[PDB]
Write an enzyme that holds these catalytic residues in place. Structure first.
Site, PDB file in Angstrom:
ATOM      1  N   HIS B 126      -3.266  21.041   7.716  1.00 26.31           N
ATOM      2  CA  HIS B 126      -2.593  20.021   8.493  1.00 26.31           C
ATOM      3  C   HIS B 126      -3.615  19.241   9.318  1.00 26.31           C
ATOM      4  CE1 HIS B 126       0.133  18.436  11.748  1.00 26.31           C
ATOM      5  NE2 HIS B 126       0.900  18.202  10.667  1.00 26.31           N
ATOM      6  N   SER B 329       8.122  29.778  -0.508  1.00 23.30           N
ATOM      7  CA  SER B 329       8.234  28.372  -0.138  1.00 23.30           C
ATOM      8  C   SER B 329       9.687  27.926  -0.176  1.00 23.30           C
ATOM      9  CB  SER B 329       7.366  27.524  -1.042  1.00 23.30           C
ATOM     10  OG  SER B 329       7.524  26.135  -0.801  1.00 23.30           O
TER      11      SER B 329
END
Ligand SMILES: [Zn+2]
Ligand SMILES: [Zn+2]
Ligand SMILES: [Zn+2]
Ligand SMILES: [Zn+2]
Lengths: 411, 411
Positions: B126, B329
């Site tokens: 990120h 996920s």
């Protein structure tokens, strides 16, 4: 000290919340020490707590996340830009999570303008400032302070002159935490000029967590304006304006933001903030407040707070309690209560022999009277008989403001 | 683009808030792109918006500011410590303002353990991570990534081996932003050990903004536990758990916090946080949620989200739309819609030829069906007649997951 989370109740939890609400009403009644406006009148906005509002990304570039308050946020930033005299197309800024973030952002901006910059701030800067310098690995030169807490521009001058080679990044305190001093913007700027620093070899951030909001509503003082060569100004929204959650407003010059701003493809926005996800209820709350009250409502509130501070100080000196109030301040520094249960009850902030009261809009004459009546009563037990006699606050607030056994004589 | 603030109305402002509430209901209905749980059920806590709650200072050392939620906050941190298997007297942490703050804190901790440390993170970290490294002036070595977005521990190994002299600070992504990959904690740790790094020459932070919360509720995957030699773990509270305002939880080892923690006299607390003033409504909100749902309510919610992701992926492949879902996920990567009004309507996050849907608790089968029906309909107009044919996502998601004119043949 802890409310344990146990496995599955709605009477237990609504029991807890009834109990807790009770303590928060009590705490709110007796709170005097910290610069938070507790007169919060945002009951209509509380419906919006149903939404996960997130201003994720640039206020001025809408991200693909649609549950946001940019119309409000941008409204508020524009008002602040007007307030500090910077035009729409000269400025950038954002609503932060508090004064600390405003400081982290502002000081980081200054570092990117001048990677080699020496950083200067007064000895009575907020802990956020020294934290920033360490986080950023910036050389920090602590500048001395006059008695009242203002930066000492003679000591500033001296310090500048021994680092003539390098650019200067400066933090100025518009309302120091403890004493409520206001660094002299104009004199700092003059000092830079006559030390050989032109505009393009210094960057100034103004930390105005409380008083940067208040100062524009007076006719006096070192006006905060980007017509002068300042770089950035932050204030805290939960301080003077009042907000359930901590927030702030950071405003800089657009040319300054380019070095921090990067595109982030998955947002369809830019990242030029310390944060990523950003509180989107704050912008609404502050917008609501600015609209309901306007420059004239805020001016009134500021003036009443200065008056109520004046009042508290006067009554303390009358009671022969050492106390000081700077000219551009709602913070009344006074002899630290010896009784630390008393300190805890009125939620006083303390440093060394000083305590202080910050006269926020919620802080009424009625409440100050309650406080004084209690203070004077208990104080009679502290320094009488063969016991010590009051501490001397002359080193901290000036001998003119001290009422110890010695300095009270000279008044 | 802006709601201007004008000088003095309560019908105008309640007009605006009615209009705005409308748009937020619409946006909330169609939101699919970002990892925010929009099923917020905290209506009883909204009363508390009347208070300026501020957890200013250490969660574990009460400051003199009494309007706080430390009982809740400490409750929540204890639950997280249990969750990640660290004992009361081994851990410290705090409730942050989001995943970015957790990352800034964690990486800063690692820097103070190893000022000379080289920093390593994957290419699909990120933006907060690279921001941290630049803010902190840390040498950042970007590590390669497998197709699915996992850190490449062969490339890691290589990179370690060319900086054998210095300590290693590592960020691991537990659920990468775009692809929803989970870095292999266990393999990273093994790689460090067999490259000659003992526990006391590396520090690991786990960025678990979304999936660090979710993973403990599965029976599988690289378990997040301080029984392994990790340093710190952050998650975002407004991601999986859901919170009106951004928040997070950062948890580290107590021995690690001493280097950041300083006493602040005017608070009667310590500063070991990035922030000063801290949101005190978040702790209550997260406490409320943990209590109502417990480990078994969260497990259910996690399992349903993995199922709903599985479902969406399946229907996309069925529709011959390139799509991938990692094992650990809830994020479904798929061919980026060509129609950018469609992207804006479902608030999709996009990178290159990928878009993605994140299946948060609010994201139902009914809603996914609405979405698919619209996607399939419009998609028919994009690649037909003499026009190009779908993009190839094989470089991004693997040729096994690509359904372009070429790769669809091989399935
Ligand atoms: Zn007077
Ligand atoms: Zn004295
Ligand atoms: Zn399947
Ligand atoms: Zn292909």
């Amino acid at each position: 000290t802890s409310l344990t989370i146990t496995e599955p109740m709605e009477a237990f939890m609504a029991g807890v919340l009834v109990r807790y609400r009770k303590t928060l009403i009590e705490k709110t009644k007796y709170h005097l020490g910290y610069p938070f406006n507790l007169d919060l009148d945002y009951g209509p906005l509380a419906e919006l707590q149903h939404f996960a509002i997130n201003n994720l990304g640039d206020p001025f570039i809408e991200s693909n996340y649609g549950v946001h308050s940019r119309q409000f946020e941008v409204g508020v930033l524009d008002w602040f830009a007007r307030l500090w005299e910077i035009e729409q197309k000269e400025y950038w800024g954002y609503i932060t999570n508090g004064g600390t973030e405003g400081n982290l952002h502002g000081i980081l901006i200054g570092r990117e303008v001048f990677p080699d910059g020496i950083f200067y701030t007064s000895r009575e800067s907020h802990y956020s400032i020294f934290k920033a310098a360490r986080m950023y690995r910036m050389e920090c030169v602590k500048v001395g302070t006059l008695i009242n807490g203002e930066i000492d521009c003679a000591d500033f001058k001296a310090k500048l002159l021994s680092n003539k080679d390098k650019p200067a990044i400066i933090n100025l305190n518009i309302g120091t935490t403890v004493k409520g001093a206001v660094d002299d913007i104009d004199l700092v700027i003059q000092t830079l000029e006559e030390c050989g620093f032109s505009h393009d070899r210094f960057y100034i951030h103004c930390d105005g967590a409380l008083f940067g909001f208040m100062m524009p509503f007076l006719n006096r003082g070192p006006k905060i304006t980007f017509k002068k060569p300042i770089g950035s100004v932050s204030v805290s929204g939960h301080k003077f304006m009042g907000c359930p959650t901590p927030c702030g407003v950071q405003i800089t010059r657009l040319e300054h933001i380019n070095a921090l701003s990067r595109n982030v493809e998955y947002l369809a926005s830019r990242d030029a903030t310390i944060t990523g996800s950003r509180n989107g209820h704050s912008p609404i709350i502050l917008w609501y407040a600015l609209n309901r009250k306007g420059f004239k409502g805020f001016q009134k509130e500021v003036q009443k707070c200065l008056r109520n501070a004046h009042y508290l100080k006067d009554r303390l000196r009358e009671a022969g309690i050492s106390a000081m109030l700077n000219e551009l301040s709602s913070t009344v520094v006074f002899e630290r209560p010896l009784d630390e249960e008393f300190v805890r009850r009125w939620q006083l902030a303390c440093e060394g022999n000083m305590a202080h009261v910050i006269v926020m809009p919620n802080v009424t004459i009625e409440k100050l009277d309650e406080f004084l009546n209690e203070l004077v009563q208990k104080r009679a037990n502290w320094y009488n008989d063969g016991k010590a006699g009051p501490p001397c606050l002359a080193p901290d607030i000036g001998s003119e403001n001290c009422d110890c056994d010695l300095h009270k004589l000279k008044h």
